[PDB]
Design a binder for this molecule. Structure first.
Ligand SMILES: NC(=O)c1cnc(C(F)(F)F)nc1
Ligand SMILES: [Zn+2]
Ligand SMILES: [Zn+2]
Ligand SMILES: [Zn+2]
Length: 585
């Protein structure tokens, strides 16, 4: 028994064809089965024919006769159909309201999550459907990992390098950081975990969560997890106040956090507030600063990734009493300078999926662009706070949507919080980039920030751009542009100072060929997000939607403190780079 995700109407029915089995009310259960292919219906039992070896599961073809369910064939003389009168049969028949359109819920219930339009719906539908979609999508995402073949150690060629044999008649996952495996040694009568792993083409290069002497017959699967049902909305109902509420501002603040005193005040006069922090504009400085501005306030610092939480801890370590901090870790190596799993400590740093059930004066959810509505709901479910602050940049990179291949996902669809920042705009904006040369600040300001991002640093005159398509080759799940690397090889012979540069591209295979040929450290744009380097060499590699995504490109070029070379494929983004043009060697 439970609550009809469309009416809320109290019902005894769940759709059995829906992978989440949402409770549906007589009206809504009915309007769902007749308009889709979903016809299995679960109650306190499954509406299936209890006749001996009868296949009939379709609720339209079934009847209650006695207190058992039957098809046309096996039914007793006295029966009524389970599914007529615009209603399916269960408890609470008399309480039931329905809807004018069940269209959105049917599409969420039945979409395969490969098209952008699916994520657009999950973000514009009603809030209760946002939760149902967020569950349905995540469960689809975890199930699709099982579709992938087991990889098995056939040969140990060296250290860091392996020969994999692959389960037959199942697809192989792409071999980039987005796919994290789990090893396993072959035991008496079962299997035991042996760390999480990632892989890259060679054989295969593996970078594992621990070190081992892993031997032949050890095998790797993408560990999937149970997706829980969602209760809390993605955003709580907004409230605006006329005084700061529940928080006591400091009398003396340092001139280091003085630029955020206005903003910290806004944080205190609404229930939840959005901070768009462009690259190197001071998000974590803002987040720790809030503690100093509201010294007595209990603050839970949260984010999706261990790395985002650890970065909030590193900043905290520099400004807040250590004895007042605790890192929550569930029973991967993360920040170990705070007492571990002390829920009652004044400053709690902890990832979304490890959050305890607790209250707080402020919740700071950092790197908000990487959040899904699933994560938004979890936070609201685990943490009851006087104030919620969502820090991020909807111009940076979202969580990867492993399933999505048709359409592009616009930032107003990354999650509820981002949707607000792109539609009404953010409550607050860090408007001065400290990290990057003026030429890169001026470019992204125009590109994705509506000419509101200001350069702290001057021009470096060390920002170059070259229009060179070269030659694209494809391997199994990536791209390579050898001529674009060749051009960098030549630039480096003529500009050897640039040998301190990080190499960035939108493809891990481009990156692998580059590491061999240039010996620069390499990053994918997606793995570079939240890191800074003096000198960046970027090869676009392709002109695909992937390699021209304005958010990817925004993150690529804003990694540079001093200088950047961009070897560009796309004439559009080339022309938007406010950089010195260099001609083809
Ligand atoms: N000044 C130029 O037109 C120019 C040509 N070529 C190069 C290369 F290939 F070394 F990167 N850098 C600059
Ligand atoms: Zn269904
Ligand atoms: Zn209903
Ligand atoms: Zn039957």
């Amino acid at each position: 028994v439970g609550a009809c995700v469309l009416c809320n109407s109290q019902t005894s029915l769940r759709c059995g064809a829906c992978i989440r089995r949402p409770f549906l009310c007589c009206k809504c259960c009915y309007d769902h089965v007749i308009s889709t292919s979903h016809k299995l219906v679960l109650s306190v039992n499954p509406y299936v024919c209890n006749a001996p070896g009868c296949d009939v599961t379709d609720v339209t073809q079934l009847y209650l006769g006695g207190m058992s369910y039957y098809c046309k064939s096996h039914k007793p003389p006295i029966s009524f159909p389970l599914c007529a009168n615009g209603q399916v049969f269960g408890l609470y028949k008399n309480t039931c309201v329905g809807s004018d359109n069940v269209t959105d819920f049917n599409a969420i219930a039945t979409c395969d999550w490969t098209n952008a339009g699916d994520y657009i719906l999950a973000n514009t539908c009603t809030e209760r459907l946002k939760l149902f979609a967020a569950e349905t999508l995540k469960a689809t995402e975890e199930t699709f990992k099982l579709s992938y073949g087991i990889a098995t150690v056939r040969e140990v060629l060296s250290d860091r390098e392996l020969h994999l044999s692959w389960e037959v008649g199942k697809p192989r996952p792409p071999l980039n950081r987005n796919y994290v495996f789990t090893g396993y040694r072959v035991t008496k009568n079962s299997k035991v975990q042996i760390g999480e792993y990632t892989f890259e083409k060679g054989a295969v290069v593996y970078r594992g969560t621990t070190t081992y002497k892993l031997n032949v017959g050890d095998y790797f699967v993408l560990t999937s997890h149970t997706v829980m049902p969602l209760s809390a909305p993605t955003l709580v109902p907004q409230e605006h106040y006329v005084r700061i509420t529940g928080l006591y501002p400091t009398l003396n603040i340092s001139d280091e956090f003085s630029s955020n005193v206005a903003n910290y005040q806004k944080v205190g006069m609404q229930k939840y507030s959005t901070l768009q922090g462009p690259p190197g504009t001071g998000k974590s400085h803002f987040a720790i600063g809030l503690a100093l501005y509201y010294p007595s306030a209990r603050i839970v610092y949260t984010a999706c990734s261990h790395a985002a939480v650890d970065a909030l801890c590193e900043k905290a370590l520099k400004y807040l009493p250590i004895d007042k901090c605790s890192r929550i870790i569930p029973a991967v190596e993360c920040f170990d300078k705070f007492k571990v799993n002390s829920t009652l400590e004044q400053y709690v740093f902890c990832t979304v999926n490890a959050l305890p059930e607790t209250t707080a004066d402020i919740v700071v959810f950092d790197e908000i662009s990487m959040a899904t509505n699933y994560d938004l709901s979890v936070v609201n479910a685990r943490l009851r706070a006087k104030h919620y602050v969502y820090i991020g940049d909807p111009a940076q990179l979202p969580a990867p949507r492993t399933l999505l291949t048709k359409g592009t996902l616009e930032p107003e669809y990354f999650n509820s919080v981002c949707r607000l920042m792109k539609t009404i705009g953010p409550d607050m904006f860090l408007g001065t980039c400290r990290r990057c040369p003026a030429e890169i600040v001026d470019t992204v300001s125009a590109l994705v920030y509506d000419n509101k991002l200001k350069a702290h640093k001057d021009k470096s005159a060390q920002c170059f751009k070259m229009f060179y398509k070269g030659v694209i080759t494809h391997d199994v799940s990536s791209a390579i542009n050898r001529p674009q690397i060749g051009v960098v090889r030549e630039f480096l012979t003529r500009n050897p100072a640039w040998r301190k540069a990080v190499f960035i591209s939108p493809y891990n295979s481009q990156n692998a060929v580059a590491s061999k040929i240039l010996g620069l450290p390499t990053q994918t744009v997606d793995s570079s997000q939240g890191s800074e380097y003096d000198y960046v060499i970027f090869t676009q590699t392709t002109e695909t939607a992937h390699s021209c995504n304005v958010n990817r490109f925004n993150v690529a070029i804003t990694r540079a403190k001093v200088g950047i070379l961009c070897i560009m494929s796309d004439r559009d983004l080339y022309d938007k780079l406010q950089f010195t043009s260099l001609e083809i060697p």
